[PDB]
């Protein structure tokens, strides 16, 4: 794991909105599915999201379905509940992927990026070789060299 400097915190909604660019990054959906097929877990969530985004990509170059001029307006919050179920599906999936990687990194004994919490080894985030001698979120002075996380037998 090379990238160990600081990272930018983006919410799931915008991490998903990047659509088929990185959210439905097919080669990233695949490479996280490989973590699941290694660990021996069912890929129910990532496969659900892949189905949804395959639909969305197939029906991105197309126009929405026509609205009717209803003062009573039902289509609106119905398509709203539809979208926000898709969104909640993807929020769950986002969390599953993050959890599996931050656990598999404690299993491979590999260090995560800076202040990337891994509850497999340390209840707080991994701070080490940082652009600041203070904790980026706790404001705790860093040890030199980077703090050590796993055992020493490799």
């Amino acid at each position: 794991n090379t990238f160990l400097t600081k990272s930018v915190a983006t919410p799931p909604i915008s991490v998903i909105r990047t659509g088929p660019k990185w959210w439905a990054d097919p080669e990233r959906m695949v490479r996280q599915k490989l973590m699941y097929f290694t660990l021996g877990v069912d890929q129910l969530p990532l496969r659900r999201t892949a189905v949804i985004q395959k639909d969305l990509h197939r029906f991105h170059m197309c126009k929405p379905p026509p609205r009717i001029g209803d003062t009573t307006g039902y289509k609106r919050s119905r398509a709203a509940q539809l979208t926000t179920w898709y969104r909640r599906i993807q929020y769950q999936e986002y969390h599953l992927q993050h959890l599996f990687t931050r656990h598999v990194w404690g299993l491979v004994r590999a260090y995560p990026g800076n202040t990337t919490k891994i509850q497999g080894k340390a209840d707080d985030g991994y701070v080490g070789y940082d652009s600041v001698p203070y904790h980026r979120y706790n404001r705790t002075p860093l040890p030199f060299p980077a703090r050590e996380i796993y055992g020493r037998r490799e």
Partner: protein, 160 residues
């Protein structure tokens, strides 16, 4: 065919570190070579900062030399042969004609009339067959003759 990133990225506003975004000159671009074009901190534009790590064409030239370094690494790694200057009399027959130089004629065929249009610029000869040529008169052959694999021989490969 190469899924590497050959081009230095356009000098634009600051690519942050999130999903789909690294530092424009982090440790992973060109195997850590962006260390030679990276500067640290929100540089004071007027007074600090090296004027040649802000331009696009010079940083791209550096990156091009580094890509060429890579091509040279893999190319010279790809050699299990060396170029041994054999006189004309002793070289095996496929190297006894007018072989035009590099980039001179079409990359010439070994021999058409013998069912081998194999690159004679890319034909490799083994010491243990050119032994009679080079160090023929040097006593005991420093390598043994080659042990061959018999394909008419009735072994497990012929379903017995």
């Amino acid at each position: 065919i190469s899924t590497g990133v050959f081009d230095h990225l356009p000098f634009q506003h600051r690519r942050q570190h999130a999903f789909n975004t690294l530092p424009l000159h982090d440790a992973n671009h060109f195997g850590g070579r962006t260390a030679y074009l990276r500067e640290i901190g929100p540089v004071n534009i007027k007074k600090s900062g090296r004027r040649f790590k802000k331009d696009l064409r010079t940083v791209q030239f550096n990156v091009d030399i580094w890509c060429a370094q890579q091509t040279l690494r893999k190319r010279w790694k790809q050699r299990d042969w060396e170029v041994i200057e054999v006189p004309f009399r002793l070289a095996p027959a496929e190297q006894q004609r007018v072989i035009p130089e590099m980039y001179t004629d079409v990359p010439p065929m070994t021999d058409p009339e013998r069912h081998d249009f194999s690159n004679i610029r890319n034909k490799v000869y083994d010491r243990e067959e050119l032994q009679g040529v080079l160090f023929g008169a040097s006593g005991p052959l420093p390598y043994p003759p080659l042990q061959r694999i018999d394909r008419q021989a009735m072994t497990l490969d012929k379903f017995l």
